Symmetry: D2
């Protein structure tokens, strides 16, 4: 299997792989290794994939279930990863952004490390979920610390409205720096997988309003732990199921 780096901090393309549910366990393994190391990986020309064949291949990586955000973070046990397939694409626009929340963290100045390591945020959905997540989580498989924030954040705990907004923007500025991100131009047969535990993503609304359809499969993740081993606190449950 070939994995080519697309950027120094994030992104990688993978070929020599016909995505589907009957993959050799060692191919599935090299893909995961790449996914964890590159945060978002891309597959071209998987015109063969359909909804069910895609659902089947995601079953191999884990347990199936605009603006900058990590997926569903208003819930305590939000997704670990997602498999997204292009199905109907607009003649122009419709490209997608991802940022590396692990690298964002590692690159912090130590003062900002100390602050984030001790900062918690309340994540809300504008069904009513409210959750208190650490701003730094320890990645369950890599041990890498990653910044947890994004659009679902409503406030930092213990801080006033003004300071919350301002610090949020400071961190979002560092996460979404172009050097730390990748913009993907979708072509038919394109497939994207990303580690929702070490990324944020953002749809770009620049196909005016043509027709756009992508299919998505989401894998189960677990509750974030901060650097001291404390878990996210649910304020308005409940967890995600299945």
């Amino acid at each position: 299997i070939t994995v080519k780096k697309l950027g120094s901090r994030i992104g990688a393309q993978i070929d020599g792989v016909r995505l589907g549910g009957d993959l050799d366990p060692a191919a599935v393994n090299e893909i995961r290794a790449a996914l964890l190391a590159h945060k978002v990986v891309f597959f071209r020309g998987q015109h063969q994939l359909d909804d069910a064949e895609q659902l089947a291949f995601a079953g191999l990586l884990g347990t199936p279930i605009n603006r900058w955000h990590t997926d569903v973070t208003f819930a305590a046990n939000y997704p670990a990863a997602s498999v997204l397939r292009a199905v109907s694409l607009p003649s122009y626009g419709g490209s997608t952004l991802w940022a590396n929340t692990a690298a964002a963290y590692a690159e912090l100045p130590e003062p900002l490390k100390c602050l984030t390591e001790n900062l918690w945020a309340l994540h809300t959905n504008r069904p009513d979920f409210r959750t208190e997540h650490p701003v730094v989580r320890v990645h369950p498989e890599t041990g890498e610390r990653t910044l947890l924030a994004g659009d679902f954040v409503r406030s930092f705990v213990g801080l006033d409205s003004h300071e919350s907004r301002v610090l949020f923007e400071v961190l979002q500025r560092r996460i979404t720096m172009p050097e730390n991100t990748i913009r993907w131009n979708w072509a038919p047969g394109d497939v994207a997988i990303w580690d929702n535990r070490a990324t944020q993503h953002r749809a770009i609304d620049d196909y005016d309003d043509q027709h756009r359809l992508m299919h998505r499969v989401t894998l189960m993740g677990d509750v974030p732990v901060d650097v001291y081993g404390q878990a996210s606190r649910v304020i308005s449950g409940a967890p995600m199921e299945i």
Copy 2:
């Protein structure tokens, strides 16, 4: 020539044309049309290009003269109108480039911000020592469109203090650099880019791990900007 839209607010790719200083006027005019409407145009497969070839093709467009979002050399009063840029040797990964539409940014402003910007002036400096008060809104000499003039050379706004100047600057830079208003170009060999420096900002991305990278650029002479009441930029230090 055939022109393909890359995004709803900025960018187009043009096929059906070989680049040289011997192109048909009817083709040069379709390209200037295309550049003016799309703000940045991309040509692929232009392998034949070469320093003097490229320089000769920029000549049909005007008179020949990075990691921070900016408009080219705005610390000068009559800064460049346009640039033609060619990749020579590219890194193995990374090394893309961003452009944003400062014309579309102005048009989308909320009414109160239109007022503010229409009456605001910035001091652009080269941090030789250039200093130039520009309007924050310039009226484009060919399209008549209003466009935002800011970017990384803006040292401050006229009649505003540092704290408010830095805060308003951000508010403006945020709207200009909205992903819906930008294009990010993955460079390939044979790639040429042309942008209207009078209606855009650009930003190089440093993510090829300081591999080696070479691009050739020809810049074209531009006019002094005029605000929406017909007043022109003022020099404080330096010459055209």
Copy 3:
């Protein structure tokens, strides 16, 4: 007749020679409205004669009677024009109040900011009305900035834009040069134009008890410089 002393270059005055009450002189009552309009906040010392009925009585000769930086209940379309406030029992330390001059704040704005605010509208809710961020003063014709802590947003702007711009404005409005901080003493009475000021209490007397009696006059609806109304 009476006396008026400037407490600062942009705001506040102290008036001497007057015994506040409902039997007060027409000329007196007139030099006071004059002083209030001109100086935005006015103070009288030594008024130990006042109870609530006489404070009111006097509020009637001026008009019609009824924390964080703010203008009084702006989330209301027709919010109060002016207040009459006296100390009842003060703490032993702290307890001072701030006023800021919104009219001078406008005047001092750079043209770019003038043009912005003359064209800006804000959403004022509680704890819901849209006002001009500049209102023409129904008596002085002075232009004044109408913001303050009741603002939830600016019409047409997004959340990051609203906050950032509100702070820019509030920072100019509450600039020390443009405010007055009053140290209360018994017998003290403050009168201010709610249509040309913001005010803020200071919570710096710990748990001591602090008690004030206030009468509020009726204010009209703000109109912008285009004759537009909330």
Copy 4:
């Protein structure tokens, strides 16, 4: 006979029952030192005697002798003033108040994430360049106090835009009115402030009126952060 009255709950006191000069008892000049430490800025009314030689004489009793933006005195220096003495000479007919803010109370009240940030944050001070901690430990009281103010040009390891934003977050907490005192200057007024645990700010609301004050600024040791580290010069 010497009485100290609190002026606000977080900052300020007036000291009555004292005439200033070089002749005060050790115990008196010590009553003054302790009030200064605990209240951060202290005021003396009706001190019509003092002159430019009486002030100096008194200053030496507390130490070793030597504007409308919130700041801490001369922080572009590695070893700035520990305290200053200020007397009114000629005052405008209106305005001319002064503001002080308590940088010890401000630190103490930071939420813990901010404490963490500030205990580890360092600032560059330029009028000359110097590197101070954002939290300094006070030589006498032990108190941790915020070291910021207008002479700060940037934070170490943060970019221009980041520095600015955080600087304002800090300043906003330091200059909160509950944490400040605004002194209305009267002739014969003497103010004394601890420059190691305060910021101060002149208010410029008296138009074109000559405001004449006379200051005696005492000597101060170099700052250390919560790890015993010290300020650097650049």
